[PDB]
Amino acid sequence: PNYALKFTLAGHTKAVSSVKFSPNGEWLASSSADKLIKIWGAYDGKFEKTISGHKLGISDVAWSSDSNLLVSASDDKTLKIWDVSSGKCLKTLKGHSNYVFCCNFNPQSNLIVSGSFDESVRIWDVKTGKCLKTLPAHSDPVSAVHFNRDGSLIVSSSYDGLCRIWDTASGQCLKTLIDDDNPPVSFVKFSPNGKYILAATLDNTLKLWDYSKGKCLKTYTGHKNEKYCIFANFSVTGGKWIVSGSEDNLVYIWNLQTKEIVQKLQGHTDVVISTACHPTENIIASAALENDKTIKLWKS
Amino acid sequence: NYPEEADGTLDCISMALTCTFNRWGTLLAVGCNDGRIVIWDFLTRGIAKIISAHIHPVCSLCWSRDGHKLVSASTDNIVSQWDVLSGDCDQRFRFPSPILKVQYHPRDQNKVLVCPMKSAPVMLTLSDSKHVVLPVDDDSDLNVVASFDRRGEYIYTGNAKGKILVLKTDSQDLVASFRVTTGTSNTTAIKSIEFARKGSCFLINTADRIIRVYDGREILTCGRDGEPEPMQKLQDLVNRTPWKKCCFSGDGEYIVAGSARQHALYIWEKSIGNLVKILHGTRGELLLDVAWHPVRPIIASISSGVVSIWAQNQVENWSAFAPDFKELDENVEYEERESEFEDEEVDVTSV
Amino acid sequence: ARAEVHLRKSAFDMFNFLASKHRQARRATSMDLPMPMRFRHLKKTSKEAVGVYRSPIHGRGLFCKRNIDAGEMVIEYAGNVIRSIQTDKREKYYDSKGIGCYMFRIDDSEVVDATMHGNAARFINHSCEPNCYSRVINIDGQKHIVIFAMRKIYRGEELTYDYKLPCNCGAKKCRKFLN
Ligand SMILES: Nc1ncnc2c1ncn2[C@@H]1O[C@H](CSCC[C@H](N)C(=O)O)[C@@H](O)[C@H]1O
Ligand SMILES: [Zn+2]
């Protein structure tokens, strides 16, 4: 529980869109809506390259399992596909009628889920880029989706309090996570086994739901998450820490064993919207929006 | 489960001759009139890979025990082991130019059984160019369909005269032999020998347009020269309906058979074996090939390049979208009440 | 785009149909065949004659894709057959919960509610010049709310009847009173 600040990955010109680690655990790269996907290192913040070649801003970039192929959820309503290795304009894939906010991958690295603001979860192809299907998801735009341990399920983060665990192959609603409240569900993800649900509803309270049973077990107190779609994570490299972004210029990292305030990290000057965990070692991604533009290497 | 309606098609490649799913059912190779190595993906319903191989219609295709090696048989006796990585030739020598079947041993991709048209079935090793010819009693039929079982124990060699002859995969042991007649006039030309995926319940297609279900366990119980009765006789009721191809389900539970006349296809089970649905089609279409998928109700229907697919029995309802909605069937009157008014540290990464 | 925290988030709707598209004599109910044959035909064919799609009239509706004939059966309004004083309890309850109340009756003894238990007949809008009505039938001692047609109802026409309150009917015979 002694994550120490190491370096600063300075250079961003707008609000940092995302800070996620590469699947090799060796490239904590980043991006923003300035058409500058700034590929940085992981241990010192060494510059590698910068992806450009869009029309409008960039919402989301997601990691393929070879740490190389990057799809861009760019705000020109395209799915422009780029590369850590080359950076060629591989496939520009239009189609969504509204802003493609988030994008993720199956663990098989052959599908492009597309969580856009157009209320239709369409699926796209890695090799060529055909609109594979179109999920009648919600009467709300999509903020976050995820696949399970293989890619057979799609969880939804709707805005009227619905987390429908969608099928992927046949593609129908299998289970709707029900709530009498209708909170704006921000960032859902499956557990790394695929059998538990962390529904990040915007009520200053994270919710760990079971997938088999379906009831909540543990929550968290004393954190500020109401407005932005603040990302949450899972960390087992040190303790059982839960890494999340902040709004009062902190780095929200607490334990499922504790559920309360036991460790805080600090130094940002804006709302931290994106956080991530190193899969093996104790490196934690922390970078805020436009009033910070810096990425802070916390390291135990 | 049992596929019902139209579902469209993937007619991306014409002149389609044969089609084969891999060990998991998840890949697909179609040799065509030119005989190319054309590969698909199924959830995308897209083409995976196209490799040109030859010019001839490649008839026989089979995957491997890992689902990563292949085999081919064109008109010019080209019988090599093929691959899914590069797909390159290994062996090629003389056979009679009509070739029916090659068949890997289901526990060894060394032992392969080559079945020509009017020749004895010949078992080849794939370590080298060795070949072992299985014995034929008649030598007047010259049409003895043979197949390994699902496990790898025995070879079931049956002539055109309804005579069964079982051989062991290495020592040719006649542990069982019999013959069948029904509505007894004479024997019947054996159309095909089949095998399921779960167990040993299997069937025989015969030229009387009647399909008789069997089981190798009672065959080995009677051993040689018993009277094995069929588990179930399957046929057409109103008409003749001559058959081109039959197949099990992905475990051997449903049994769906393809007619050779009408392009309107018939579905049965194994246990009951009821005609549950006639899958219709265009009358002006010639059915040529049928394939089935293990964990999905795919009907791969090659009809002269047209590969059309019918895949259903999934009908959407409510209470998964809105689980508060309790869909009654008829009018349910009731009163629900007889009086109308902890810290377990649970692992989240438990793999 | 990650900075403008926008409104228009919660919908207060238990069903979520609002997709991108929402694509809106032989039969016994038109024959002189008896009422048990018509009622057995009704449950098997209301599942396959009509469909629920998003309604520009109000909410989500019942948009048929078939030339529905005149005077024949269309759909059966089946749901919670609750007592007449459980009506007021569930009205207070779904006033406290926001789910729309669906209480059409057979008589003044028990009223069919359509909130928990229901069918596609929940999605029937009101036109003051409708294309259907209803008649109380008698099957096997039970009574059934059966929506009988009026004219040839074309492909794409949403289905409405007389309920007997300003409406979105769009008709010029409008009562604006449904009490
Ligand atoms: N034609 C119409 N115009 C205005 N309100 C109507 C109407 N028809 C029915 N209503 C009222 O509106 C409610 C329908 S709920 C609206 C439809 C559906 N629940 C949906 O949105 O998906 C009913 O309680 C009914 O009393
Ligand atoms: Zn009106």
**Position B331 in a domain:** no
Closest CA to A36 of A16, A19, A22, A20: A16
Nearest residue, CB atoms, A217 vs list B46, B346, B349:
B346
**Position B341 in a domain:** no
| DSSP class of B277 | E
Parallel/antiparallel/unpaired status of strands A100-105 and A92-93: unpaired
CA of C154 from ligand 2 middle (Å) equals 21
Chains that touch A (3 or more CB pairs under 8 A): B, C
Q: How far apart are CA A298 and CA A290, in angstroms?
A: 20
Q: Taking the CB of residue A271, how many other CB atoms lie within 10 A of it?
A: 23
Q: Which residue of B has its CA nearest to C114?
A: B325
Nearest residue, CB atoms, C110 vs list B327, B328, B333:
B333
Q: How far apart are CA A10 and CA A8, in angstroms?
A: 6
Burial annotation A77-104 (CB, 10 A radius, 16+ → b, else e):
bbbbbbbbeebeebbbbebbeebbbbbb
Q: Which residue of C has its CA nearest to A231?
A: C2
Chains that touch B (3 or more CB pairs under 8 A): A, C
CA of B231 from ligand 2 middle (Å) equals 66
Alpha helices in chain B (DSSP H): 216-222
In this structure, which residue's CA is closest to atom 23 in ligand 1? C100
Technique of determination: cryo-EM
**Position B228 in a domain:** yes
CATH number of the domain residue B164 falls in: 2.130.10.10
Question: Which chain C residues touch B322 with a CB distance below 8 Å?
Answer: 14-16
Closest CA to B192 of B237, B228, B147: B147
Closest CA to A275 of A186, A208, A195: A186
Return the HEC string of C55-108.
Answer: CCCCCEEEECCCCECCCCEEEECCCEEEECCHHHHHHHHHHHHCCCCCEEECCC
Q: Contact, B172 vs B165, CB < 8 A?
A: no
DSSP string spanning A21-34? E-TTS--EEEEETT
Q: Taking the CB of residue A165, how many other CB atoms lie within 10 A of it?
A: 19
CA of C174 from ligand 2 middle (Å) equals 6
Sequence letter at residue B121 = P
Question: Which chain C residues touch A97 with a CB distance below 8 Å?
Answer: 20
Closest CA to A214 of A187, A180, A175, A186: A175
Q: Taking the CB of residue B123, how many other CB atoms lie within 10 A of it?
A: 24
Q: How far apart are CA B273 and CA B336, in angstroms?
A: 43
CB contact under 8 A, A196 and B348: yes
- Reading the block at residue B36, the tokens are 């190319």
CATH numbers and ranges of domains, chain A: 1-300 (2.130.10.10)
Q: Which residue of B has its CA nearest to C99?
A: B324
Q: CB-hemisphere CA count at 13 Å for C35?
A: 12
Q: Which residue of C has its CA nearest to B319?
A: C15
- Chain A residues contacting C, CB < 8 Å? 15, 17, 33, 57, 59, 75, 97, 99, 101, 118-120, 134, 136-140, 159-162, 182-184, 227-229, 273, 289-290
Sign of CA dihedral C38, C42, C44, C48: positive
Can you give the residue range of the structural domain that contains B244? 9-310
**Position B182 in a domain:** yes
Exposed / middle / buried, residue C121 (Cβ in 10 Å: 0-12, 13-18, 19+): buried
Question: Which chain C residues touch A184 with a CB distance below 8 Å?
Answer: 9-10
DSSP string spanning B114-166? EEESSS--EEEESSSS-EEEPP-S-SSS---B--B-SSSSEEEEE-TTSBEEE
Burial annotation A196-232 (CB, 10 A radius, 16+ → b, else e):
bbbbbbbeeebbbbebeeeeebbebeebbbeebbbbb
Sequence letter at residue A93 = L
Tell me the helix, strand and coil percentages in chain B, rounded to 5.
0, 35, 65
Mutate to test the pocket of ligand 1, among C55, C87, C105, C125 (most ligand atoms within 8 A of CB): C125
Alpha helices in A59-109 (DSSP H): none
Which value in Å is the resolution of this experimental model? 4.5
- Reading the block at residue A190, the tokens are 């499956």
Closest CA to A31 of A63, A7, A77: A63
Nearest residue, CB atoms, C117 vs list B321, B332, B335:
B332
CB contact under 8 A, A182 and C12: yes
State whether residue A81 is helix, strand or coil. strand
In this structure, which residue's CA is closest to atom 10 in ligand 1? C125
| DSSP class of A211 | S
Contacts of A78 (CB under 8 A, 6+ apart): A54, A55, A72, A92, A93, A94, A100
Element (DSSP H or E) covering residue A58: strand A58-63
Question: Which chain A residues touch B12 with a CB distance below 8 Å?
Answer: none
Q: How far apart are CA A200 and CA A258, in angstroms?
A: 18
- Structural domain count, chain B: 1
**Position B299 in a domain:** yes
C64 is in an annotated binding site: no
CA of C165 from ligand 2 middle (Å) equals 9
CA of C98 from ligand 2 middle (Å) equals 22
Q: How far apart are CA A41 and CA A48, in angstroms?
A: 7
Closest CA to C12 of A117, A161, A229: A161
Closest CA to B324 of C124, C95, A179, A140: A179
Chains that touch C (3 or more CB pairs under 8 A): A, B
Q: What are the angstrom distances between the C-alpha of A95 and each of A59, A105, A132?
A: 16, 19, 12
